[PDB]
Design a protein around this nucleic acid. Structure first.
Lengths: 146, 58, 154, 165, 48, 97, 292, 142, 338, 157, 48, 50, 141, 49
RNA sequence: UAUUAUAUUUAUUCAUAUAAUUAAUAGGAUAAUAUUUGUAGUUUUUGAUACCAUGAUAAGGAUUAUAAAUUGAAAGUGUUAAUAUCAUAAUCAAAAUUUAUUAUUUAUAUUAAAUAUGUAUGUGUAGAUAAAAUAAGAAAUUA
């Protein structure tokens, strides 16, 4: 006939309240206070997982340091190179960026001992083989024992 | 700005020359903010729930 | 004077047609009127053009006056002569302003933009620090650094 | 000016008073605040577009770090970075599968509960109906592609298939 | 239309059409579904 | 939720995602209601102590009220205990005055 | 007093795809919860009235006196003894305050009538439906599937909006009634179609600050410089406060009664009262350290 | 697209000269790699802070049976010249072995060393149309 | 006649069962009754179906690293597999081993429930990686070859139903099912006290007995298996002097009903009752007397009852607290049970 | 497989599960990877407890561990595939062909609005919209307003 | 904890199968088929 | 190193012919334009630069 | 949408012709990089010519007086040391302190490319004919 | 200002009405559109085959 | 005829895809008891595929208008619902330009964060071409 209530009737509200339970986490009873020491370090299953950033995982991170040292040996983490500890053996390992110390670039950095020049125009024309005579006394730096 | 004592520091400059003539770079690669970076761009701005933008969190 | 790279050559008709945007730029009409009131000259031309463009701006949001269906057609070239007197007024004024600035720059001893002739100092245009080692209009190699124009006492 | 950050004890002054860097230290202790020490003094920039109300986008909070040398590569970034655990990436992950019913239950379980059998896809039953009919009017176009052929190449002790006509 | 079918729970065209409820009819509660109350199963779990 | 994520396989983990998104626990306190007397007979926080508190906390206070947002733990009870601890600890700090 | 006084603020924000859905939804729920809140403060108000009914020096509890006088010193430069009556005027003033706020609520709860009900102003109604600006997701997107031309995709741009409007019901009840809250939670089920509810609860609490565990001691001798707050120092260099303080003190051999107090920074009698199982101190024993 | 160089040309449209957001590309076609940037050598197309650990085509993370080729993402170091071993990059068309080792390579990734877009093009893959087209743009004469 | 991908399979049940079983038919799937799933594959063919089915971290790929084939033809160009021994001369091997993929159990919640780090997700429930035998997550031999076929494979036969089960997985899935698939009460009726938790339990009990509460709690934070009852005895005992009713109640509840009711022992209840006394809590005295009274579920089903002498000692402590604290009504209540 | 009994019309619709489990592995290795990057990169001394020599050996060990973390998902979230669930269309995020809030592409989503499958509200094509933010400051402004509410408004403890 | 997993599909479907083998599918959502759709009161005043 | 004194295939590649003209399509020749200014006519060149 | 044609086969041996082609390409890069670093660092350490422009004050004053006498009597050694490069020149000017801010606001400096020619050049063809094989980003002579 | 003055002294409305100070120019830019290169007016280059 | 104006302005150097197995349900604490702790019948079919395998939504201005009004349309542009019977081609990083259907930053200061384009100085310069009367400011030859 074309009717719909403006407000759910009390009776069907009562059905919709009854048919379903009440969660125990809706009451918020409190008489003891906050447990400063245990409640946060309570059982690892019913644990309060911090969430969000790393800056809230203080227990897990001490734990990660401890596990990672407990498994990862220096006999494995030794070889891991930096970029500079390998870039050291470039014929030009170091040249100042043109920003600031472009006035601090020296000629002496230029390995002219590995390339050659024609004086009629002043260009460096070719590069001698350095991968032949390349003799390093510290192939990995002095802190490396294998 | 509370600054570490024993550290030799500058103050925010006065003359509009020193910024032109410092070695300060411009932001070349992508532009991140540690929270915004979740949404990955302005155009594809993500949201977990359809909450109001004027939401007054309790 | 900062802008000394190359510039784009636009005719007066289109430099004026920009209307109340730059041609009747009020803050530019003013700042060129200040050159005149410094030098001590009557601002007859710039004031004439300012009057015309104040009229045109006041009567831009309005419709033209109705035409009659005349086979004899007089309104047409009469409004034509009207417009082209306004246009000639503004051509004269364009030239006056340009001349006064290119003379005042030789007086302030300030350098003009590239290939901006200043008959106060040099019969040809100011070429210096250009994107080309040839003259932009004479095809003459440029000196390094920029050519010098005025005296050296400042 | 190039000024040395100096801080005199609350004991040197002929009036003791809690000094502000010590208060900074107490606060970075209480709320576990990392004190970045390479923080230069000449870079106290604020985001005007966000901090200054003379732009259309005044936010009041510095909606970003005016610092071009920025990237997720940095540990100072990684510290204050919200992790994708329980973010929209997870919600999308756990609800955006091509078929939505396969996110509410298992299709066989739903079928064996509401119907009896576990029904095929609409697409499969399309293929099967077309089989039912294009093998009704005609035959000899099929192929025999199987997962396992041992039982077809090797039927049971009986099962001598019928030759058609 | 399609093998990847319609889903009757997100789609406004379905939820709204004459065989469902439109948004301008006053979208109330139509009948209270008390199901867990007429006869509740016993608690029997697979995992003992 | 009571539309669609109310009932099936996704109900569980959606309830997780919801309540974790909402896991924040905001704690507001009235510094005027810190202006009380410790049962030692000492005023719990005097004007100098309020100064030390407002200066310990940069942005946590406002309009005469101090706010801390417990954002750490997924469970609201654990954000509750955490925020209570942090509040109590910033109080023990500011109380040196 | 009245409209700006509260203890528990429930802002139920109802979300719906259509602002008319939530415009009427909020009226439904606002009248439901006006009839609820009216009954729950009628209950609490008859309770408060019958309580304030017979207050005098002959109506009081030992728990309350032991809470009123659990103080070592007060305003007169001397510890305060609060009787049944000095606490009587206190509890009666408090209950006067609570009844004033409660009856202001109920008065707001009868004032809206079908004729001129204004639920978008609290000054008339309890509760008031606060609008919340809608979540609105406008998105440009192509419509053409042209693979050759980006222009002909661009010119096809259609803007469409995912709207989601809300309404915020603000019950500022001046006292938390878990039973009313029970009545509020199960609107989560009788809510309308495509409409849900987020409950914001802002309820007053009590968090105790306490002596042993969270000490307001002097600065240490060794100063915690910037090194103790570097990166990952938040997890390596510091513990999760508070400090665990050994509340068990071992007796020295030639100890006294006041020597262990002069060693632990306590009064002799307070140490007696935190170790009330002993009369004279023997060696090797353990003693409960009072938080004082 | 048009001529399916990969099986994904079978799958992805072109969208004309579609303008893209700065640095958001579904196909990382590092067409700039072998770019000599003289004072910017340890910076251009390289890791950012000089003091970084190596990338991860540089350590056998597990118990491999082996690999067929390294990436360009593994830096060139002393072991890449002196060991004189086989280090292969999946470049067009199949692979590219760094068998003429030198020391200047030491320090960078092999991206600055593996040419992405070759100056020699085989008309053996081009169409009867593409060849005239590369004549048009000035690549192959005719 | 037939072009088939799998030549032959295997039966799941064996002939000591089938030869008696076959005499009743199976009511099979109507549209495709014969279901040659993943369980029926051979060992080798299924090693193929397990090797492949991942992007670069399934060894099925020629340059995935754990690949078996030595030759691969790249559009009529042959490439051959440079082995580890040729490779280590420039890709120095760092291989911590099988323990470097198994995170500690104290990082499960930080890693979103997981312990492994495999490409192949490792569900801890049985019904997901179950190949023929239920998949047990053995964290001691987790290889990249993955012999046990326990992994939640990506692109294998019959992977779709299990990927759907994985995405419809619960909120607390790895943690709950990992807990329960281990650590169950033995038919001897006893609680699961283990071998590797005994020394850590010694650490906890000693620290808590010394009174170092937060220290014992940080150590308890490492209780992976169940602790014996004395550990809770000490961790509640430490609270007595400071009156930490809150920390104490939480220490009780963590074994009470959560860890097979280890914490339901008369002396732990006695410690927590003492804390209720020293914290001056009429309602906590009654809560502890309530757990003492128990109900049928604990007192009978889980059989975590308290010896009547301990019932009496706790009841006399309750009366001694209450009638000393003038709480006449509640003391009379406890004496009513007496 | 081998096109025998296909139940779905798009064989590529397995890539959506493939992607969602990519996302799962990303959530699983996310915290570990982020802490690994932090510690391996940290230059200024961590704390007064770990410093210097121990710092170098620890840094290199955790880098060895980040490398040994096989199964680790270090591909950036902007670099993962992003495909429509319905018709398996891929959409490049950041451009018009990607509906963000419904995780669909110009194509399938266009189909789902010109048929009734999504509930959207058509607004004018040239303007800015109904949201006062999206009208006020373009798109970075609504980005700012979204982060401001999801992160910046909490006076974080 | 029981709310995080009470809406399990199989828990739904064991309620369904229990109602089934107890012979009650009238209150249930899926397992009921209402095939008799009620008609309206026709109007004598508007018969067009 | 030891840069080989003979180049095998890289240096032999077809020479990409430099762009002949300037401007749009690199075809706009080197001849006078509309933009050239005049120094023989007036104190303000015509057309003037702005 | 016409079905995209499969790319035809790469061909015979071309996988190895590309091998040798790229091989000698990086070979050629060896020398190109060598020569380019030579040219860039000589560019760096070479004393450059004036960065400022003598068309504006205070650098339009005579080469005898004003800021020029200050340049000769405080910084004449520093500029020759730091190679006249405009960046260190302007920073020594910023640290001379007796000019104020002017070393930006009033001083006019040559463009970046008119600034980086060595000392005492007199052609305009120098910048437009600097070598195009030294991939210095134009940071060569 | 015109509405301010009409509101302070009404009979000043008539000169303000007549002068059109209370007039609202019903104008705005062309909205922001990607189909336009500047976003406002220009459609991208059109080319015949 | 009237119910009413285009001859002006700004424009043209344009490119990106990759390394095969999509077939199913299986509940765990604060619940009056299932080891169902760990639920084991292999092998009778074949389309959305590298391959024919219908349908269904774009771009495009030239005469319904002035006032309280918007200068964007249906003729369908790749992914979609009934034709079968060659082959697994599908992003988890690092990638190979021939594809008409594209607005590049122009001489005071030039590489710091997932890496981020080293080429083309030249009289604004052939031919033909682009856009627009909309918060900008334009004015006169209807079929």
């Amino acid at each position: 006939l074309g009717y719909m209530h403006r407000y759910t009737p009390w009776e069907w509200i009562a059905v919709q309240e009854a048919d379903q339970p009440l969660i125990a986490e809706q009451i918020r009873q409190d008489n003891i206070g906050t447990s400063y020491f245990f409640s946060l370090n309570r059982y690892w299953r019913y644990k309060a997982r911090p969430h969000g950033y790393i800056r809230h995982f203080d227990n897990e991170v001490r734990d990660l340091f401890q596990f990672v040292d407990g498994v990862t040996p220096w006999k494995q983490a030794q070889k891991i190179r930096t970029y500079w500890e390998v870039r050291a053996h470039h014929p030009m390992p170091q040249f100042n960026r043109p920003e600031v110390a472009m006035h601090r670039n020296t000629v002496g950095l230029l390995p002219a001992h590995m390339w050659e020049t024609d004086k009629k125009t002043g260009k460096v024309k070719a590069v001698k083989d350095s991968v032949r005579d390349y003799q390093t006394k510290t192939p990995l730096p002095k802190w490396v024992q294998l | 700005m509370q600054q570490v004592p024993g550290k030799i520091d500058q103050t925010p400059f006065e003359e509009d020359q020193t910024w032109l003539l410092n070695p300060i770079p411009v932001q070349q690669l992508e532009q991140h903010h540690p929270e915004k970076d979740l949404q990955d761009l302005p155009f594809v701005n993500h949201e977990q729930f359809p909450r109001s933008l004027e939401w007054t969190a309790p | 004077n900062t802008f000394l790279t190359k510039s784009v050559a636009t005719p007066p008709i289109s430099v004026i047609r920009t209307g109340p945007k730059w041609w009747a730029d009020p803050e530019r009409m003013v700042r060129q009127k200040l050159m005149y009131f410094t030098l001590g000259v009557d601002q007859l031309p710039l004031r004439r053009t300012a009057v015309i463009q104040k009229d045109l701006h006041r009567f831009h949001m309005c419709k033209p006056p109705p035409r009659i269906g005349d086979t004899t057609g007089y309104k047409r070239s009469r409004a034509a002569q009207l417009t082209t007197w306004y246009r000639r007024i503004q051509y004269q004024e364009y030239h006056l302003q340009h001349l006064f600035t290119r003379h005042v720059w030789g007086l302030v001893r300030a350098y003009p933009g590239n290939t901006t002739k200043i008959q106060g100092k040099a019969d040809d245009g100011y070429v210096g620090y250009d994107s080309v080692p040839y003259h932009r209009y004479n095809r003459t190699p440029l000196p390094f650094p920029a050519r010098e124009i005025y005296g050296r006492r400042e | 000016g190039v000024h040395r950050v100096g801080y005199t004890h609350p004991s040197t002054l002929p009036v003791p008073c809690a000094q502000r860097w010590d208060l900074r230290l107490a606060r970075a202790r209480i709320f576990q605040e990392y004190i970045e020490e390479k923080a230069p003094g000449a870079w106290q920039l604020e985001d005007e577009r966000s901090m200054s109300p003379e732009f259309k986008t005044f936010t009041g909070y510095p909606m970003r770090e005016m610092r071009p040398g920025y990237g997720q590569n940095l540990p100072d970034f990684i510290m204050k970075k919200r992790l994708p655990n329980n973010t929209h990436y997870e919600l999308f992950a756990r609800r955006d599968i091509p078929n939505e019913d396969n996110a509410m239950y298992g299709k066989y379980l739903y079928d064996m509960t509401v119907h009896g059998t576990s029904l095929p896809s609409t697409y499969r039953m399309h293929k099967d109906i077309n089989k039912a009919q294009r093998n009704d009017r005609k035959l000899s176009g099929n192929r025999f592609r199987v997962l396992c052929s041992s039982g077809a190449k090797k039927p049971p002790s009986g099962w001598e298939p019928i030759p058609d006509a | 239309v399609g093998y990847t079918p319609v889903n009757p729970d997100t789609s406004p065209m379905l939820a709204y059409s004459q065989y469902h409820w439109h948004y301008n009819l006053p979208q109330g509660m139509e009948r209270p579904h008390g199901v867990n109350r007429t006869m509740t199963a016993p608690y029997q779990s697979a995992h003992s | 939720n009571n539309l669609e994520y109310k009932r099936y396989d996704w109900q569980g983990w959606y309830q997780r995602m919801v309540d974790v998104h909402n896991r924040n626990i905001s704690l507001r306190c009235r510094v005027s209601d810190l202006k009380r007397l410790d049962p030692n007979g000492v005023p719990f926080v005097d004007m100098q102590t309020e100064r030390r508190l407002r200066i310990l906390a940069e942005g946590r206070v406002g309009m005469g009220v101090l706010m801390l947002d417990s954002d750490k733990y997924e469970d609201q009870k654990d954000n509750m205990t955490f925020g209570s601890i942090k509040l109590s600890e910033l109080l023990s700090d500011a109380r040196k005055a | 007093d009245g409209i700006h006084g509260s203890e528990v603020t429930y802002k139920i924000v109802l979300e719906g795809f259509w602002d008319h859905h939530v415009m009427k939804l909020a009226e439904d729920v606002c009248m439901f919860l006006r009839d609820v809140g009216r009954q729950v403060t009628e209950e609490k108000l008859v309770a408060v009235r019958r309580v304030m009914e017979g207050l005098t020096g002959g109506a009081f509890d030992p728990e309350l006196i032991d809470f009123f006088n659990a103080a070592r010193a007060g305003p007169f430069g001397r510890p305060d003894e609060y009787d049944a009556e000095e606490v009587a005027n206190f509890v009666r003033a408090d209950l006067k305050r609570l009844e004033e706020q409660c009856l202001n609520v109920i008065n707001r709860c009868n004032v809206p009538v079908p004729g001129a009900t204004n639920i978008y102003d609290p000054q008339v109604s309890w509760p008031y439906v606060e609008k919340l600006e809608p979540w609105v997701r406008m998105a440009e997107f192509w419509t053409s599937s042209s693979d050759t031309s980006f222009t002909e995709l661009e010119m096809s741009t259609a803007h469409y909006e995912f709207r989601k409007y809300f309404r915020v019901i603000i019950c500022k009840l001046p006292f938390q009634s878990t039973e009313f809250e029970k009545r509020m939670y199960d609107i989560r089920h009788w809510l309308h179609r495509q409409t849900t509810c987020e409950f914001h609860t802002i309820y007053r609490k009590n968090v105790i600050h306490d002596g042993s565990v969270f000490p307001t001691e002097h600065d240490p001798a060794t100063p915690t410089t910037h090194d103790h707050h570097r990166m990952f120092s938040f997890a390596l260099d510091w513990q999760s406060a508070p400090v665990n303080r050994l509340s068990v003190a071992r007796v020295l051999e030639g100890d006294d009664w006041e020597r262990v107090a002069q060693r632990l920074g306590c009064s002799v009698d307070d140490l007696k009262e935190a170790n009330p199982a002993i009369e004279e101190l023997e060696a090797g024993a353990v003693l409960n350290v009072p938080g004082g | 697209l048009k001529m399916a160089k990969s099986a994904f040309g079978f799958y992805l449209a072109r969208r004309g000269q579609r303008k893209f957001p700065f640095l958001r590309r579904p196909h990382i076609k590092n067409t700039h790699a072998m770019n000599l940037s003289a004072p910017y050598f340890w910076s251009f197309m390289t890791a950012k802070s000089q003091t970084y650990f190596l990338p991860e085509e540089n350590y056998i993370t597990g118990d491999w049976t082996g690999k067929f080729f390294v990436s360009k993402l593994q830096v060139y170091t002393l072991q890449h010249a002196t060991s004189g071993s086989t280090v292969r990059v999946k470049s067009f068309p199949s692979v590219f072995e760094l068998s003429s080792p030198s020391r200047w390579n030491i320090g960078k990734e092999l991206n600055t060393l593996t040419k992405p877009r070759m100056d020699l093009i085989d008309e053996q893959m081009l169409t009867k149309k593409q060849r005239l087209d590369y004549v048009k743009a000035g690549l192959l004469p005719k | 006649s037939v072009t088939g991908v799998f030549s032959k399979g295997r039966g799941i049940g064996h002939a000591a069962v089938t030869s008696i079983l076959r005499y009743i038919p199976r009511a099979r799937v109507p549209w495709q009754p014969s279901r040659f799933g993943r369980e029926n594959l051979s060992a080798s063919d299924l090693a193929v179906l397990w090797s492949r089915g991942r992007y670069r971290d399934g060894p099925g790929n020629y340059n995935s690293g754990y690949h078996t084939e030595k030759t691969h033809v790249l559009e009529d160009n042959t490439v051959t597999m440079i082995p580890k021994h040729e490779l280590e001369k420039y890709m120095p091997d760092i291989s911590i081993g099988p323990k470097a993929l198994v995170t500690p159990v104290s990082l499960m919640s930080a890693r979103n429930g997981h312990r492994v780090t495999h490409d192949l997700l490792h569900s801890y429930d049985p019904h997901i990686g179950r190949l023929d035998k239920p998949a047990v997550v053995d964290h001691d031999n987790i290889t990249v070859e993955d012999p046990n076929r326990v992994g939640l494979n990506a692109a294998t036969l019959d992977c779709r139903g299990r990927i759907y089960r994985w995405l419809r997985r619960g909120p607390f899935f790895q943690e709950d099912h990992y807990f329960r698939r281990s650590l169950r009460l033995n038919r001897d009726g006893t609680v699961p006290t283990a071998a590797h938790e005994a020394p850590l339990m010694r650490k906890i009990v000693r620290l808590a007995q010394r009174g170092h509460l937060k220290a014992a709690c940080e150590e308890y934070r490492r209780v992976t298996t169940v602790p014996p009852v004395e550990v809770y005895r000490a961790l509640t005992a430490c609270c007595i002097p400071g009156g930490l009713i809150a920390d104490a109640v939480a220490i009780f509840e963590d074994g009470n009903s959560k860890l097979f009711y280890v914490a339901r022992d008369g002396e732990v209840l006695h410690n927590v009752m003492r804390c209720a006394i020293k914290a001056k809590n009429r309602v906590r005295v009654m809560w502890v007397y309530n757990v003492m009274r128990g109900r049928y579920y604990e007192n009978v089903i889980v059989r975590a009852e308290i010896d009547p002498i301990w019932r009496y000692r706790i009841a006399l402590l309750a009366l001694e607290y209450f009638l000393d604290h003038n709480c006449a009504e509640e003391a009379g209540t406890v004496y009513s049970y007496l | 497989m081998r096109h025998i009994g296909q139940d779905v019309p798009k064989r590529h619709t397995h890539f959506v599960l493939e992607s969602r489990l990519m996302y799962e592995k990303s959530f699983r290795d996310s915290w570990l990877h982020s802490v690994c990057r932090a510690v391996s990169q940290i230059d200024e001394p961590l704390s007064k407890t770990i410093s210097g020599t121990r710092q170098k050996m620890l840094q290199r060990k955790v880098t060895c561990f980040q490398y040994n973390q096989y199964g680790l998902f270090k591909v950036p979230y902007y670099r993962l595939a992003n495909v429509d669930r319905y018709h398996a269309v891929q959409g490049v995020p950041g451009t018009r062909e990607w509906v963000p809030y419904a995780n669909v592409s110009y194509w399938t989503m266009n189909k789902m609005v010109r048929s009734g499958n999504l509930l959207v509200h058509r607004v004018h094509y040239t303007g800015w919209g109904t949201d006062p933010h999206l009208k006020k400051g373009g798109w970075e402004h609504r980005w700012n307003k979204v982060m401001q509410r999801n992160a910046l408004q909490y006076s974080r403890i | 904890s029981r709310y995080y997993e009470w809406g399990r599909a199989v828990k739904q479907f064991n309620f369904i199968e229990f109602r089934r083998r107890n012979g009650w599918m009238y209150d249930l959502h899926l397992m009921k088929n209402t095939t008799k759709q009620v008609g309206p009161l026709r109007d004598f005043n508007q018969p067009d | 190193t030891a840069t080989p004194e003979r180049f095998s295939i890289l240096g032999t590649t077809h020479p990409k012919p430099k762009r002949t003209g300037f401007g749009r399509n690199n075809k706009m020749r080197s001849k006078p334009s509309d933009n050239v200014a005049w120094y023989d006519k007036g104190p303000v060149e015509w057309l003037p630069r702005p | 949408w016409a079905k995209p044609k499969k790319r035809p086969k790469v061909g015979q041996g071309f996988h190895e012709k590309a091998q040798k082609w790229r091989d000698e390409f990086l070979l050629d890069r060896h020398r190109i990089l060598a020569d380019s670093l030579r040219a860039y660092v000589e560019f760096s350490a070479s004393k450059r010519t004036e960065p400022w422009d003598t068309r504006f004050r205070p650098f339009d004053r005579v080469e005898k007086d004003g800021v020029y006498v200050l340049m000769r009597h405080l910084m004449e050694d520093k500029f020759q040391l730091c190679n006249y490069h405009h960046r260190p020149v302007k920073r020594l000017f910023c640290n001379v302190g007796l000019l104020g801010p002017q070393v930006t606001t009033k001083a006019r400096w040559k463009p970046y490319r008119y600034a980086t020619n060595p000392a005492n050049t007199s052609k305009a063809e120098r910048i437009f004919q600097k070598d195009k094989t030294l991939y210095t980003h134009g940071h060569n002579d | 200002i015109a509405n301010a003055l009409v509101k302070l002294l009404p009979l000043t409305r008539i000169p303000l009405k007549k002068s059109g100070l209370l007039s609202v120019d019903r104008r705005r830019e062309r909205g922001q559109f990607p189909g336009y290169l500047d976003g406002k007016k220009v459609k991208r280059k059109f080319a015949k085959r």
